[PDB]
Amino acid sequence: MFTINAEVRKEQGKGASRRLRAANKFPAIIYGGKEAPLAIELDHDKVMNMQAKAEFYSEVLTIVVDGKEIKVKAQDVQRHPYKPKLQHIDFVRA
Amino acid sequence: ALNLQDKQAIVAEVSEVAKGALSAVVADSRGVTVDKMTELRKAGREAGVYMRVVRNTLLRRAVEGTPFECLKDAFVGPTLIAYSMEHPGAAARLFKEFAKANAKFEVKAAAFEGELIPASQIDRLATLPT
Amino acid sequence: QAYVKLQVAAGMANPSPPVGPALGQQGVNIMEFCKAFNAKTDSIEKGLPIPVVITVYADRSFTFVTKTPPAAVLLKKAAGIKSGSGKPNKDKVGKISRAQLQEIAQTKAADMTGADIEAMTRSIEGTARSMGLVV
Amino acid sequence: MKVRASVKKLCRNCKIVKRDGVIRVICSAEPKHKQRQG
Amino acid sequence: MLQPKRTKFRKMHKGRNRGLAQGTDVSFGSFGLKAVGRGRLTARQIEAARRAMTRAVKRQGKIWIRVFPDKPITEKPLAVRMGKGKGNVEYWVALIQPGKVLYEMDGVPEELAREAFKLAAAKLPIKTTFVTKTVM
RNA sequence: AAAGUCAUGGUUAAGUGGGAAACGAUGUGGGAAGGCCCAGACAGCCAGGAUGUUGGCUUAGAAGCAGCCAUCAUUUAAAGA
Ligand SMILES: [Mg+2]
Ligand SMILES: [Mg+2]
Ligand SMILES: [Mg+2]
Ligand SMILES: [Mg+2]
Ligand SMILES: [Mg+2]
Ligand SMILES: [Mg+2]
Ligand SMILES: [Mg+2]
Ligand SMILES: [Zn+2]
């Protein structure tokens, strides 16, 4: 059972996303169901060890944000073009 | 190899130790292939592939199972003397094959303690009950 | 003490063109290299290569313990082949059947090294497969 | 001696050493594997 | 040497080579040779790096070449002045951006494909890195 | 040659700073897992590297070592035709 921490993004856009990935982070979003989309930001080195498992893209993950277990699945991922890093992850609510 | 499968290789000592009563010892200053074959080619004409010629005489491995079973062996952790637990026997006839191979091209690393199964002395009691 | 095995089959007694200087190194005269080679060679069936152990005692004498011929020649009578394996995977020579090895497995269970005949059975499987002749 | 911009362990008994600011490959089994970076 | 069988036009402008690459995932095989550098690969460079990885795996496996040279390059000869036309087509290139998987392979152990994409990276003028197939 | 031999916390030992690439290298600082261990590791020292076996040919003799092939398998601590 993967558990991932997350804070809610204050600022959004092109320059703010560049400014997170410098500081060992990357933005994500959770979308699905009756509830609005939730734009969160993740820690880069914690997820990059989890993502190297083939069990990551098949199980129902749990993101903890503002004290709330949200059970989502990995829908899409943007990888860096030549560095082994992560740019952005989509999550669809389970 | 990781420690959990080593933790059944402490269990693998026990049931060999539990069944075995008589044990003879050796060391290797000049460990030859054939100097261990002298006791195993001799073993096949008597019994099976039951026996281990491997060593467990390390400062935690045969030390922990010693208050468990056969408590005299908690002193021979160091000083380079190993264990080979033959499963049957009661003062059997399988002693000097590690020891007579010392005279035949080996330079005496063992000093042949004898394991004291009737709690005997260090002298070889070559009487063998037929 | 140099107990290595070097001769050809029975038809060449005192075999100076096959042996040469090989067993002729020591101070032992050749009259017990040729005629005391016949204590096992003419003692059985001729023509087949018996290896013989020479350990040179200090009194110019020797004794030995006999054994079976190699995995070529006792299997060569069970093959009949003359050239061994001429490029097997690019064109085949033949094969060795498994069940024919039983007669030799009950033959060589006297001196050949070990007590488990069944463990010697898969020993002559892959050894027969080693000869270009897939068992 | 070999003098090369690329020096390497060529066999199993080659040791890479740095003496006075130069990477050298000194060997003990083979005299042909001795090297000096240049 | 790879080359188009036909072109609509014989010549082309020079252009620029900015941007990131598109064929970034390993699509077909299991392992890749991704481009970290920028530049252009001529057809003699693409094909010398193919003979070096084909020989290294001993005709056992399957190789993909993800890039094709289709930009013709002109040159003017020696002792020719600057006007009087555009030069004659001399060779063919492929324009490479950072993030381009160049070659692919499967059907080999991963340790054999480390060492064949090393003997073939030697013949290329851009800096490369070894990638594998990812799940999503 | 006018104005900080300024404070604080780091890095560099190359006069790098104060010219140059593919490539090479136990140079040195930092970081999350990387990755083997008190069922004694890692490095040295006490030691084998057997057995069938020399696996057979074409060759100059072909035996692990000229190349060509199978490269299994026993006595099984382990020893790879
Ligand atoms: Mg901007
Ligand atoms: Mg000097
Ligand atoms: Mg343009
Ligand atoms: Mg483009
Ligand atoms: Mg002044
Ligand atoms: Mg100061
Ligand atoms: Mg060590
Ligand atoms: Zn060397």
Side-chain angles (χ1 to χ4, degrees):
Chain A
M1 182 177 179
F2 295 94
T3 299
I4 288 167
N5 287 111
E7 290 89 359
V8 184
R9 294 178 69 192
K10 272 84 73 176
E11 56 181 2
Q12 298 174 1
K14 183 169 187 175
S17 302
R18 296 277 182 90
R19 202 178 298 125
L20 283 170
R21 297 187 186 96
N24 208 178
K25 285 178 174 179
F26 63 98
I29 196 162
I30 295 166
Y31 58 90
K34 61 184 170 65
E35 192 175 359
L38 181 65
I40 62 166
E41 54 89 11
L42 298 174
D43 192 75
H44 178 265
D45 283 330
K46 296 295 180 186
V47 180
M48 192 67 197
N49 287 318
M50 290 182 177
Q51 77 93 31
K53 301 173 176 63
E55 191 174 359
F56 186 78
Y57 296 99
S58 69
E59 285 184 350
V60 176
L61 278 68
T62 300
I63 289 171
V64 178
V65 50
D66 282 332
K68 185 178 179 182
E69 297 92 2
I70 301 173
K71 291 180 287 295
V72 295
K73 295 179 71 68
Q75 182 69 41
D76 186 74
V77 61
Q78 295 177 359
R79 297 180 190 269
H80 192 276
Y82 56 93
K83 297 177 180 180
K85 296 178 74 173
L86 300 174
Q87 293 284 109
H88 181 266
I89 297 179
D90 288 328
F91 294 112
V92 172
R93 288 181 176 92
Chain B
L2 61 90
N3 200 4
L4 296 171
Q5 297 301 108
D6 295 334
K7 190 166 71 173
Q8 299 302 112
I10 303 301
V11 172
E13 181 176 2
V14 171
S15 68
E16 293 175 353
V17 164
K19 191 72 74 178
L22 186 79
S23 293
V25 293
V26 77
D28 279 325
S29 174
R30 193 185 297 271
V32 180
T33 53
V34 180
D35 286 338
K36 309 292 108 171
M37 296 175 189
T38 53
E39 300 87 4
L40 295 169
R41 192 180 299 111
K42 190 182 91 277
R45 195 180 293 274
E46 182 173 0
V49 199
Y50 68 99
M51 186 181 173
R52 292 296 178 271
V53 71
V54 300
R55 299 182 178 87
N56 52 7
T57 175
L58 193 56
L59 275 71
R60 291 287 191 272
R61 292 182 67 88
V63 180
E64 186 266 331
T66 309
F68 190 78
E69 283 177 352
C70 188
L71 279 80
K72 181 62 72 172
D73 295 329
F75 295 88
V76 201
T79 66
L80 72 156
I81 287 298
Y83 299 92
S84 70
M85 296 303 288
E86 294 169 351
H87 294 170
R93 300 185 287 114
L94 295 173
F95 185 77
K96 64 181 72 175
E97 192 67 29
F98 294 100
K100 292 292 185 184
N102 196 1
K104 292 176 70 175
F105 293 101
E106 188 173 359
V107 199
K108 199 254 180 64
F112 51 98
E113 59 182 2
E115 287 286 328
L116 59 98
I117 295 95
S120 176
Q121 76 279 14
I122 200 168
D123 181 71
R124 293 188 295 268
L125 299 177
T127 299
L128 293 171
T130 62
Chain C
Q1 186 176 0
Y3 59 106
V4 295
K5 277 76 65 178
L6 35 93
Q7 75 271 22
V8 294
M12 295 297 170
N14 203 5
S16 178
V19 168
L23 54 81
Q25 186 66 38
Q26 287 83 17
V28 181
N29 196 358
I30 316 167
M31 194 180 78
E32 296 179 358
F33 284 112
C34 61
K35 287 179 67 67
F37 176 73
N38 292 317
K40 190 68 182 180
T41 296
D42 289 336
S43 175
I44 61 162
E45 180 181 5
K46 299 185 294 293
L48 274 74
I50 304 165
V52 60
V53 170
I54 302 298
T55 303
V56 179
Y57 289 158
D59 295 330
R60 200 180 55 81
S61 296
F62 62 94
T63 189
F64 63 98
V65 172
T66 183
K67 64 184 292 294
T68 73
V73 293
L74 210 162
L75 284 174
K76 280 173 181 177
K77 74 187 291 292
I81 64 169
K82 272 71 64 180
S83 295
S85 181
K87 276 77 66 178
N89 295 109
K90 291 182 180 179
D91 51 351
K92 292 184 177 66
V93 172
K95 64 179 182 178
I96 301 298
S97 182
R98 182 185 62 84
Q100 290 181 357
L101 291 174
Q102 184 180 4
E103 185 183 1
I104 302 169
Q106 61 191 350
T107 302
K108 293 197 292 180
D111 191 73
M112 291 292 101
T113 62
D116 197 359
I117 303 170
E118 189 176 3
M120 296 177 183
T121 305
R122 76 262 188 100
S123 180
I124 315 166
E125 287 183 354
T127 299
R129 189 183 286 119
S130 72
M131 302 176 188
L133 308 171
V134 176
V135 67
Chain D
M1 186 67 78
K2 292 173 177 63
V3 51
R4 288 175 173 176
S6 175
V7 292
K8 288 177 182 177
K9 295 170 187 172
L10 295 182
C11 73
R12 294 202 299 265
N13 297 121
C14 291
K15 291 181 183 178
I16 293 169
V17 70
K18 185 177 183 181
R19 287 173 180 169
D20 198 71
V22 176
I23 290 297
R24 298 177 178 269
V25 177
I26 57 98
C27 180
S28 66
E30 183 67 31
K32 284 180 182 182
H33 294 176
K34 61 186 290 188
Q35 282 164 346
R36 189 261 187 197
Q37 198 178 8
Chain E
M1 287 169 66
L2 294 176
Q3 173 182 355
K5 298 177 182 70
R6 295 184 66 250
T7 50
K8 198 186 291 185
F9 298 103
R10 189 182 183 272
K11 293 175 180 176
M12 195 185 287
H13 296 314
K14 184 167 68 177
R16 301 291 180 266
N17 196 4
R18 50 199 298 278
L20 280 307
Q22 300 290 321
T24 298
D25 283 323
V26 180
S27 295
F28 292 140
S30 184
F31 312 117
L33 183 57
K34 187 181 279 186
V36 172
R38 192 175 297 274
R40 52 174 64 178
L41 293 176
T42 67
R44 294 187 183 275
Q45 293 173 355
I46 294 172
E47 200 265 333
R50 185 197 56 81
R51 298 174 183 175
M53 61 175 71
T54 298
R55 190 189 297 113
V57 306
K58 291 292 293 295
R59 66 173 59 85
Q60 288 298 109
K62 191 170 173 65
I63 302 169
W64 288 266
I65 304 169
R66 299 286 303 277
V67 294
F68 188 81
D70 59 350
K71 182 181 177 183
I73 300 298
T74 64
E75 287 179 350
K76 304 185 87 69
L78 192 68
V80 179
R81 286 175 183 162
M82 279 293 105
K84 286 92 174 65
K86 185 179 173 68
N88 298 322
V89 172
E90 198 71 27
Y91 57 94
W92 295 84
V93 302
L95 296 182
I96 305 300
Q97 287 89 21
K100 176 65 75 175
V101 168
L102 299 174
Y103 294 98
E104 288 187 357
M105 190 180 286
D106 63 352
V108 292
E110 192 270 338
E111 188 269 332
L112 185 68
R114 295 302 296 260
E115 197 266 332
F117 289 164
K118 184 178 176 181
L119 299 181
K123 282 91 173 69
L124 300 175
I126 65 170
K127 194 179 264 78
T128 56
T129 194
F130 185 86
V131 297
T132 63
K133 173 177 277 290
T134 66
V135 179
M136 188 179 289

